[PDB]
Amino acid sequence: AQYEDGKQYTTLEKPVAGAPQVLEFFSFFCPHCYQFEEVLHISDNVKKKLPEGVKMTKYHVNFMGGDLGKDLTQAWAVAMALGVEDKVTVPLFEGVQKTQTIRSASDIRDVFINAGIKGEEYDAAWNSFVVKSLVAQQEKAAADVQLRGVPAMFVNGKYQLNPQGMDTSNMDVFVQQYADTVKYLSEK
């Protein structure tokens, strides 16, 4: 074929029922995630090729950056609750990996403040039980597929993207191949 199991994707030996249709996992400590977000814009170019009717989900994971990782998972939950993902994603990445200015929950908070979410509103979200369940969701979905590495994408809880098995000479071509694969798997 042109799309082979084990080549552009792999299949989960035990499939995950009820899964979000397109499910992406990342960490702000994850270097490829940084590339995936800042240079490649994977999520974005995937959305542009997806069928209509497709919802896209993105979750943070705990297994990188220890105690700050868990904090970042709770903060990503706040972003999701407030719908401010597109306003904090880049400064979180650059604060963890470029400038090294995020070293505590308080430093994470500053990024939201400086992106214009109000202190009161952030702290309230931070502490809210809506946010607790969103954190639980992020952890559950990762658990369901036994996640051990990021970046990682899952389609319909059955298929897992395999970027190692695509051409990387040309970034633009990599992205197209990646997204087209998502679309193919989506139609499966």
Which of 40, 72, 68, 42 has the alpha carbon at shortest distance from 59?
Answer: 72
3-state secondary structure 127-186: HCHHHHHHHHHHHHHHHHCCCCCCCEEEECCCEEECHHHCCCCCHHHHHHHHHHHHHHHH
Which of 71, 79, 68 has the alpha carbon at shortest distance from 130?
Answer: 79
How far is 3 from 118, CA to CA, in rounded Å?
Answer: 47
- Report the 10 Å Cβ neighbour count for 59: 25
Do residues 12 and 134 make contact, with C-beta atoms less than 8 angstroms apart?
no
How far is 95 from 91, CA to CA, in rounded Å?
Answer: 6
Q: Which two tokens stand for residue 146?
A: 């036994």
Domains of the chain with CATH codes: 1-188 (3.40.30.10)
Three-class SS of residue 59?
A: strand
How far is 39 from 41, CA to CA, in rounded Å?
Answer: 6
How far is 151 from 25, CA to CA, in rounded Å?
Answer: 6
Do residues 156 and 183 make contact, with C-beta atoms less than 8 angstroms apart?
no
Handedness of CA 179, 182, 184, 187 (dihedral sign): negative
Q: What's at 6, amino acid-wise?
A: G
Q: How was this structure determined?
A: X-ray
Q: How far is CA 67 from CA 11, 50, 64, 73, in A?
A: 32, 35, 9, 10
Three-class SS of residue 54?
A: coil
How far is 109 from 96, CA to CA, in rounded Å?
Answer: 13
Give this entry's resolution in angstroms.
Answer: 2.4
User: What's the farthest any 2 CA atoms get from each other in the chain?
Assistant: 55
Alpha helices in 3-158 (DSSP H): 31-34, 42-49, 66-82, 85-93, 105-114, 119-127, 129-144
How far is 76 from 60, CA to CA, in rounded Å?
Answer: 7
Cα 161 → chain centroid: 13
Residue whose tokens read 């401010």: 84
